[PDB]
Amino acid sequence: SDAERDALNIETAIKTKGVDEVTIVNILTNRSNAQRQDIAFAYQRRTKKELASALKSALSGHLETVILGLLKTPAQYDASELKASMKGLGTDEDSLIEIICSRTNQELQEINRVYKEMYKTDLEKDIISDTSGDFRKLMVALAKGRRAEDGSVIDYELIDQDARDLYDAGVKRKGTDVPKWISIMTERSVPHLQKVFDRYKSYSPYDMLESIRKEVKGDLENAFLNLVQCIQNKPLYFADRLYDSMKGKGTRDKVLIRIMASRSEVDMLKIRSEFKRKYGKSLYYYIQQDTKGDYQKALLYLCGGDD
DNA sequence: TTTTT
Ligand SMILES: [Ca+2]
Ligand SMILES: [Ca+2]
Ligand SMILES: [Ca+2]
Ligand SMILES: [Ca+2]
Ligand SMILES: [Ca+2]
Numbered sequence: 001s002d003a004e005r006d007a008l009n010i011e012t013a014i015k016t017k018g019v020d021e022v023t024i025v026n027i028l029t030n031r032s033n034a035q036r037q038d039i040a041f042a043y044q045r046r047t048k049k050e051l052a053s054a055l056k057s058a059l060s061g062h063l064e065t066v067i068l069g070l071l072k073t074p075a076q077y078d079a080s081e082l083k084a085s086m087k088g089l090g091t092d093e094d095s096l097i098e099i100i101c102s103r104t105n106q107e108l109q110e111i112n113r114v115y116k117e118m119y120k121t122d123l124e125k126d127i128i129s130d131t132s133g134d135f136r137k138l139m140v141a142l143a144k145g146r147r148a149e150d151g152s153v154i155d156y157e158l159i160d161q162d163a164r165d166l167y168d169a170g171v172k173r174k175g176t177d178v179p180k181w182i183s184i185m186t187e188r189s190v191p192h193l194q195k196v197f198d199r200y201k202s203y204s205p206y207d208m209l210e211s212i213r214k215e216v217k218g219d220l221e222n223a224f225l226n227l228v229q230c231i232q233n234k235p236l237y238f239a240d241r242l243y244d245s246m247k248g249k250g251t252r253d254k255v256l257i258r259i260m261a262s263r264s265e266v267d268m269l270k271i272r273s274e275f276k277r278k279y280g281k282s283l284y285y286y287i288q289q290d291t292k293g294d295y296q297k298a299l300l301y302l303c304g305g306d307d
Numbered sequence: 308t309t310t311t312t
Contacts, residue, residue, distance in 0.1 A: 053308080056308085083309095083310085119309095119310075120310090
């Protein structure tokens with residue numbers, strides 16, 4: 001791909017009668033995030049106008065949402081989707097939960113950095129202002145992106161202690177020591193907590209998910225359930241969420257666009273394998289059945305192929 | 308335009 005050739009073709013398509021939405025999708029959804037930035041700079045040189053702003057005026061509907069997200073860097077997109085979710089008077093806890101629970105340390109520290117630059121306040125402060133209680137404690141801890149990294153020697157002794165501790169703090173006692181749960185689950189490494197969750201099955205008659213459902217409710221319950229899935233198998237999590245966004249009446253397009261756009265160059269192939277092996281048909285197939293038009297062709301290129 | 312009541 002030639003960034004200057006693409007910026008030219010995208011300009012010719014914006015200026016074709018009715019807008020040539022097809023050429024725009026073919027290019028942009030078939031280029032890395034770096035190549036999209038290149039195109040966006042080249043466009044700005046040929047025209048002295050921002051690509052993002054020209055496309056907002058040229059497109060509409062779901063297609064516009066997809067393509068303007070694509071034009072953002074990974075940290076910028078996630079940052080913007082965290083602001084969108086915390087905007088207005090209410091909060092979109094689900095979207096918040098999904099982005100925070102599923103981002104790595106490296107991803108979270110750049111999001112924290114870029115969020116400051118775009119919106120002139122700190123992500124933490126914006127989280128504190130829109131969530132309360134233990135759900136705020138959990139979200140604040142997760143968003144620091146400071147969870148311990150995997151050691152070289154497995155720490156079997158602490159795996160057992162942590163599993164015991166999760167149990168003492170929950171299903172065993174009356175009430176719940178929620179901060180014990182927040183500590184263990186925000187601070188320990190992902191490979192470690194994978195082992196904890198299995199060892200926990202040794203003490204408790206319920207597994208980690210059952211125990212969450214039986215111990216807390218509401219946002220806190222959702223925050224912990226998403227978090228355990230992301231620790232256990234992150235591509236499976238995104239496949240399950242992709243399925244939920246499409247399985248019944250209509251489409252939660254917001255979730256479908258966000259996963260396809262943010263996971264396309266990260267783990268889309270792993271997501272597709274889990275979706276196929278659990279649901280029997282491809283992620284590609286569910287997208288084809290649920291959406292129409294340029295919008296559909298856009299999500300399908302992000303998918304990257306039928307399974 | 309995108310934040311902000
Ligand atoms: Ca428009
Ligand atoms: Ca809000
Ligand atoms: Ca209890
Ligand atoms: Ca419950
Ligand atoms: Ca549907």
